[PDB]
Amino acid sequence: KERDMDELKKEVSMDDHKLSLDELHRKYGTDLSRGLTPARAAEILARDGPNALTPPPTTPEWVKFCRQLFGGFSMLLWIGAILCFLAYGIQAATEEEPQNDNLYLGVVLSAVVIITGCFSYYQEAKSSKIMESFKNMVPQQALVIRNGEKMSINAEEVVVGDLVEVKGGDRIPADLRIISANGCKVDNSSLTGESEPQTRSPDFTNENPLETRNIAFFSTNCVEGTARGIVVYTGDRTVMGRIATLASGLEGGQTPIAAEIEHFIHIITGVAVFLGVSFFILSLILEYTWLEAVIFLIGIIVANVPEGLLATVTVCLTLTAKRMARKNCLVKNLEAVETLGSTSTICSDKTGTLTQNRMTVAHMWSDNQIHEADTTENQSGVSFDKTSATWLALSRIAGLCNRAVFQANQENLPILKRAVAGDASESALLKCIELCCGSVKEMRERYTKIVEIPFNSTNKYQLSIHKNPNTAEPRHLLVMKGAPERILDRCSSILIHGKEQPLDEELKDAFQNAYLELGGLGERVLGFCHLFLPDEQFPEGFQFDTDDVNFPLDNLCFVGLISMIDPPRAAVPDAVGKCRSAGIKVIMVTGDHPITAKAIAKGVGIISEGNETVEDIAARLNIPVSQVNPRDAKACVVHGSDLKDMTSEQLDDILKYHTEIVFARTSPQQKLIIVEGCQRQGAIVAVTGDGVNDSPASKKADIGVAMGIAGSDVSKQAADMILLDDNFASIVTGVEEGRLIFDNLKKSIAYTLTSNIPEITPFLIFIIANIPLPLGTVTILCIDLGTDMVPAISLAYEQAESDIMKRQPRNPKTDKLVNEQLISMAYGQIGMIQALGGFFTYFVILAENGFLPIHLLGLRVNWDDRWINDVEDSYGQQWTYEQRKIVEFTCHTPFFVTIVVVQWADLVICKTRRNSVFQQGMKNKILIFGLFEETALAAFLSYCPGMGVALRMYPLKPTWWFCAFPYSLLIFVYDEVRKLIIRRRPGGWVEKETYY
Amino acid sequence: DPFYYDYETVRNGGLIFAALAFIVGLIIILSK
Amino acid sequence: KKFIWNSEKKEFLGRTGGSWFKILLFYVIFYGCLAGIFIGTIQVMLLTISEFKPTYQDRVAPPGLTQIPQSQKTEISFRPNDPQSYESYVVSIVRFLEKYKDLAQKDDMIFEDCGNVPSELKERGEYNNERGERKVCRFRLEWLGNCSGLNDETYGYKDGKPCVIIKLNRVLGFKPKPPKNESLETYPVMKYNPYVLPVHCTGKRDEDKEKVGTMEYFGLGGYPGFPLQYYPYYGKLLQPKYLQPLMAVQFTNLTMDTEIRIECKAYGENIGYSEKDRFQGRFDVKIEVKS
Ligand SMILES: C[C@@H]1O[C@@H](O[C@H]2C[C@@H](O)[C@]3(CO)[C@H]4[C@H](O)C[C@]5(C)[C@@H](C6=CC(=O)OC6)CC[C@]5(O)[C@@H]4CC[C@]3(O)C2)[C@H](O)[C@H](O)[C@H]1O
Ligand SMILES: *[C@@H]1O[C@H](CO)[C@@H](O[C@@H]2O[C@H](CO)[C@@H](O)[C@H](O)[C@H]2NC(C)=O)[C@H](O)[C@H]1NC(C)=O
Ligand SMILES: *[C@@H]1O[C@H](CO)[C@@H](O[C@@H]2O[C@H](CO)[C@@H](O)[C@H](O)[C@H]2NC(C)=O)[C@H](O)[C@H]1NC(C)=O
Ligand SMILES: CC(C)CCC[C@@H](C)[C@H]1CC[C@H]2[C@@H]3CC=C4C[C@@H](O)CC[C@]4(C)[C@H]3CC[C@]12C
Ligand SMILES: CC(C)CCC[C@@H](C)[C@H]1CC[C@H]2[C@@H]3CC=C4C[C@@H](O)CC[C@]4(C)[C@H]3CC[C@]12C
Ligand SMILES: *[C@@H]1O[C@H](CO)[C@@H](O)[C@H](O)[C@H]1NC(C)=O
Ligand SMILES: [Mg+2]
Ligand SMILES: [Mg+2]
Ligand code: NA
């Protein structure tokens, strides 16, 4: 009955916050100033559970090891092993002196599956282990008032309905219902994505529990001020608790690479059983009994199973994941390394993902001129002009009149990433002055503060008077900051290049348009002013006690505005541009306010400059918004309030007719609804986030990307990829590698799928032509799992043939990893030539040793007989059993060598899919070593002492090594002219039939 | 007699070829 | 998704008609060229070998030693009474000796009377085709006494005390070289050491050697071996209807209703052996005359 449990969790939360203090205390039974008796607290603590989310579902290690032992590819190898032992049982119980070929082959296939499982499991376990080294869960004790006394207890010992007090810096324990605040501002960034610190007031403001100010939330941090509140929700019943529990209980889906491997097996077994059944009927039509034909059916089907392609594909994925871990972009799931490239719609988060989630001084005003400050996370941008007197005055106004200071350990840390104590706005100002104006320590103590005035509840103004240390004037320096509408009413002089001027409207209106420019840009602006107090009316001994009008409120000297906002990360805009260049639809999904979301969207690239929303056109024409046709608006902003009243068809139309979309004020549950709406179109989705609100969105997405440090633990676990460096450019690297390894997997698969024809054709014509067996089983093992392993592994290291970040994302319904152009190449054209070359070396060995090829027909009847030791060749000679068997095995060895010789050309042509081998170039050192080791190993297997005894591989007469050269050269020339016609004629024949 | 083949020399040459090609390939993947 | 068979916009089994013809025509031309290339190279390969001699002859260095009753497991188990029990043996013996009858060797243009006494090797020039079709020395069944007879169409052989003739693997240009007069313990054997390849049979262990009481050998002129006057072989092309030497072996005193192992080892310098091939040089048999 878990369906209903999950459905009641996909719904946005309800509440009872809108209640009078008396109704609240009556419903919960708690003293508003004394809380409750500790006995009542323990009575609830041992009644519903400690205030902590239920731990995640533990995943025992034998479960995921058994998981790696199964799947889709390893399962095909499992059914192959099963068929091997079934065929071996039949051959054992039915005929005399049965052979151990099928049994050794079955145990080899089982070993292949087990070893691949061990390696893949070791890799995924390594990812999870290095992930556990990031859980630095430090216990945090809450300040709870019970029985009339203040006590600090563990966060888990907190219960429902008890007074809890929070101080600026402390973390909100459970979901509180504020009862009394004192200029308290909390941080709803990790939960609701609200960037700027939202204040918390005891009065109910909004019907939505998330938007209202009478509710503090689990895992949120009280930035500044102090407050009180009654715990309404505790443990898993909390807001972030319901979000996390929803995240864990969601579906992961099927990755695109997995679906490609599955369809790949569909074609592999399709032709395998087609050949097996058609040859089963063919063998029965010839002469062989049901006993023999059944063994033929199993032999042909099992032979068409790429035994080593499993290890090669696993190593391929592991290599690309290694490169991902090199750039601090760790992937938890191995196949997740491919999903970024196949993505075609990225749903991103604003606060903490698209942005730095930190207030930063954006722009400044001076000399009626806008000066943009560097807002990069690492300070690698343009520096404004810092040589004017207006700046030397404005910088002192900000550095002095501000309740912001660095803490104790803030020494070795950089100027930006270091922690600042106080308001977020004051923190941004302190960092900007400490960065572009030397230091604020000696600059603040240089002007001894006399009397200050903090921020006011109404007409919010902050002023302070300081002594003047200049060596030319002893007049007192008074400074004040505040909202521009509060400072314009208290200003008459204006600073410019060092001198003063009146409040002429020619420049005052120029100040107003600048205020609306920085304000309309989604930023928060503040005004800074100062004035020289006359030391004749206020001498150096006079003390201006903060009571009456000791300072002139008006007639001040305005220096300039200072705006601020959370800026996007450094490589965020360029990365968004790269994704759009690759044809990836970028859609912003955030719960922040739309006025800021739209500005950041235009600032990073989600909304292209010039494109207009449905509201922008109505504003440019001064007409109602209900008149403009939505088709004339490319981009669109969708509010969460409006999103709640939407159907499936409406959301489908929103994504189909609008190319640049921004979802604002959307709840985490709505984020999940949006991700599902994107998946309904049939496109691969990647969700990039950091907060707990991104957990249900990262989980249901085809691939989730969590920020390694600025992210929450729940969204980090429910994700499929972690960015340990928080460099958003890693998404671009990922989408590039996902396409790169996709193409390389295609090349390597065509390589392993090419050798199947010369591996099976000997047995096929052995059944038809009744000739001695041309190729042996152990030799086939030496090819599939011996020589070919290094070349196929090296085929992963191939680079881009053209610009992959230029082509559009692959269509999942069209660009399959293994299409009929690969089957037409490997099974149809290259493997065919390789099989003919093998048979050529075969006939050479037998015709040179006395058995002319024409004489080999119908010879296997007496050839395989173990007692007819007088088998006439073409010259009338009599061959014993072991003598001719020595020739057959010393005929299997050059067939294997022939395979290596033709694999040289097949590897060189498979290395390039469209380019020429000279255009691309043999720059792949792993491939060079692949050919050297492949040939050296093939030679070693034939000339090592005792191989005709152990592996029954006998030494070769050197001329055998040259019987396969013309076939390899032919393979290379054919594929080269193939890629030449593909280049010169990109229309359709060579491209739509062979180019795979 | 034509009923004899110097298999030891061919075998020895093949083993030397296998040794040299492998050490050369190792030098190839060790570009220094 | 698996009913892509057809549509009103044409497709059959997956593609259209005009596409099926293009692919089929391409595959026919492609595979045709592949066939022609394989045939041309296989022809060059045929041009690298001659008609009178195999290029590599080292894989048949030690000639084999076969017998007439090609048993399923080199075992001779039958009943001295039931004629159908030993039918499979006699049938193969008569068919084998069907080409050795006096009527089969009647043409004097391809047959040459070697002699009643084993003589030295007979080299008929070189192996080229400059000379005509060489002659093949005759070998009448009378040479194998007590294992030939003048029977009718069916050679009534030995029911009790059976016969098992041995044959040396026909090898082109092979010149048998019997051991020197310094014979390193080759059991009882006649003094006709220089012009006949000796072949001596025996048991396999202390048990088999005791069960097998007496053995009687039959050959050319009464010698247990192969005469050198019938070697070397000049291939089937130059010497068709060639009759390699034969030598019979009869086991008179056997222990009826008992399976005993016999090892007929052919001796000589040019005769090698093999611990892996029990037929190279030597020869094994499991006789059991169960009554
Ligand atoms: C008609 C039949 O022919 C001979 O046997 C034949 C059947 C069976 O015995 C085997 C050994 O088991 C088969 C086996 O089945 C399937 C294979 C493992 C197969 C695969 C390669 C691969 O990669 O996957 C599958 C290709 C051929 C194969 O390698 C061997 C080759 C030796 C052979 O011996 C051949 C004997 O002479 C027998 O006595 C006589 O009855
Ligand atoms: C071939 O078989 C005949 C039997 O038909 C053997 O002839 C006997 O020989 C012994 C001497 O060994 C005489 O005592 C008998 O009187 C003979 N019997 C007959 C009916 O002739 C003959 O010895 C056998 N030949 C060989 C070489 O063993
Ligand atoms: C043939 O073999 C038989 C054994 O089957 C020999 O005769 C036996 O001799 C032993 C004494 O050594 C006696 O105990 C048996 O009773 C005898 N059996 C028979 C059936 O006579 C016989 O000597 C052998 N003959 C030859 C010529 O080798
Ligand atoms: C396409 C070209 C560049 C490949 C270059 C490598 C070629 C020339 C190498 C690869 C394997 C080599 C063979 C390896 C094994 C044997 C057996 C040895 O006892 C004699 C040499 C001989 C017969 C070699 C001849 C040269 C050979 C065919
Ligand atoms: C005209 C050109 C392009 C044709 C290219 C293929 C040529 C080079 C191929 C075709 C047939 C080949 C021959 C096939 C048969 C033999 C016997 C073998 O035991 C040694 C190699 C040898 C001697 C080959 C040498 C190379 C060869 C002549
Ligand atoms: C072998 O030696 C014996 C005597 O030991 C002799 O009678 C015989 O003629 C010799 N044969 C040859 C070929 O030398
Ligand atoms: Mg966030
Ligand atoms: Mg294979
Ligand atoms: Na997932």
How is this structure best described in words?
The complex is a heterotrimer of chains A (996), B (32) and C (291). Chain A has 38 helices and 28 strands. Chain A has 996 residues and is α+β, with helices and mostly antiparallel strands. Chain A has four domains: 2-41 and 137-247, Calcium-transporting ATPase, cytoplasmic transduction domain A; 306-321 and 737-993, Calcium-transporting ATPase, transmembrane domain, CATH 1.20.1110.10; 328-355 and 570-726, 3-Layer(aba) Sandwich (Rossmann fold), CATH 3.40.50.1000; 360-565, 3-Layer(aba) Sandwich (Calcium-transporting ATPase, cytoplasmic domain N), CATH 3.40.1110. In chain A, helix 19 runs parallel beside helix 27. The radius of gyration of chain A is 38 Å and the shape is elongated. Chain C has two domains: 1-49, no CATH class; 50-291, no CATH class. The chains are: A alpha+beta (996), B mainly alpha (32), C alpha+beta (291). The structure holds ouabain, a molecule of 2 linked components (NAG-NAG) (2 copies), cholesterol (2 copies), 2-acetamido-2-deoxy-beta-D-glucopyranose, magnesium ion (MG) (2 copies) and sodium ion. Ouabain binds next to helix 6, helix 10 and helix 29 of chain A.
Question: Mind sketching the topology for me?
Answer:
The complex is a heterotrimer of chains A (996), B (32) and C (291).
Chain A: H1 2-10, H2 21-28, H3 38-48, H4 61-69, H5 73-94, H6 101-132, E1 141-146, E2 149-154, E3 163-167, E4 175-187, H7 189-192, E5 198-199, E6 215-216, E7 221-233, H8 239-248, H9 256-286, H10 290-303, H11 309-326, E8 329-331, H12 336-342, E9 345-348, H13 350-354, E10 360-366, E11 369-372, H14 389-400, E12 405-406, E13 420-421, H15 424-436, H16 441-445, E14 449-453, E15 461-466, E16 476-482, H17 484-488, E17 493-496, E18 499-501, H18 505-520, E19 524-533, E20 557-565, H19 572-581, E21 585-589, H20 594-604, H21 614-621, E22 635-639, H22 640-643, H23 648-657, E23 660-664, H24 668-680, E24 685-689, H25 695-700, E25 703-707, H26 713-717, E26 721-723, H27 730-754, H28 756-768, H29 777-787, H30 789-794, H31 820-848, H32 860-863, E27 871-872, E28 878-879, H33 881-910, H34 917-920, H35 925-943, H36 947-950, H37 965-984, H38 989-993
Parallel strand pairs in A: 9-21, 9-24, 17-20, 21-23, 22-23, 24-25, 25-26
Antiparallel strand pairs in A: 1-2, 1-3, 3-7, 4-5, 4-6, 4-7, 8-26, 10-11, 10-20, 12-13, 14-15, 15-16, 16-19, 17-18, 19-20, 27-28
Helix pairs in contact in A: 4-6, 5-6, 5-10, 6-11, 9-10, 11-27, 12-27, 14-15, 19-27, 23-24, 27-31, 27-33, 28-31, 29-33, 31-33, 31-37, 33-35, 33-37
Chain B: H1 7-28
Chain C: H1 17-47, E1 65-67, E2 75-78, H2 87-96, E3 111-112, E4 136-137, E5 163-168, E6 196-202, H3 208-211, E7 215-218, E8 225-227, H4 235-238, E9 246-251, E10 260-266, E11 284-289
Parallel strand pairs in C: 2-11, 3-4
Antiparallel strand pairs in C: 1-5, 5-9, 6-8, 6-10, 7-9, 10-11
The structure holds ouabain, a molecule of 2 linked components (NAG-NAG) (2 copies), cholesterol (CLR) (2 copies), 2-acetamido-2-deoxy-beta-D-glucopyranose, magnesium ion (2 copies) and sodium ion (NA).
One cholesterol sits between chains A (935, 939, 958, 961) and B (10, 13-14, 17).
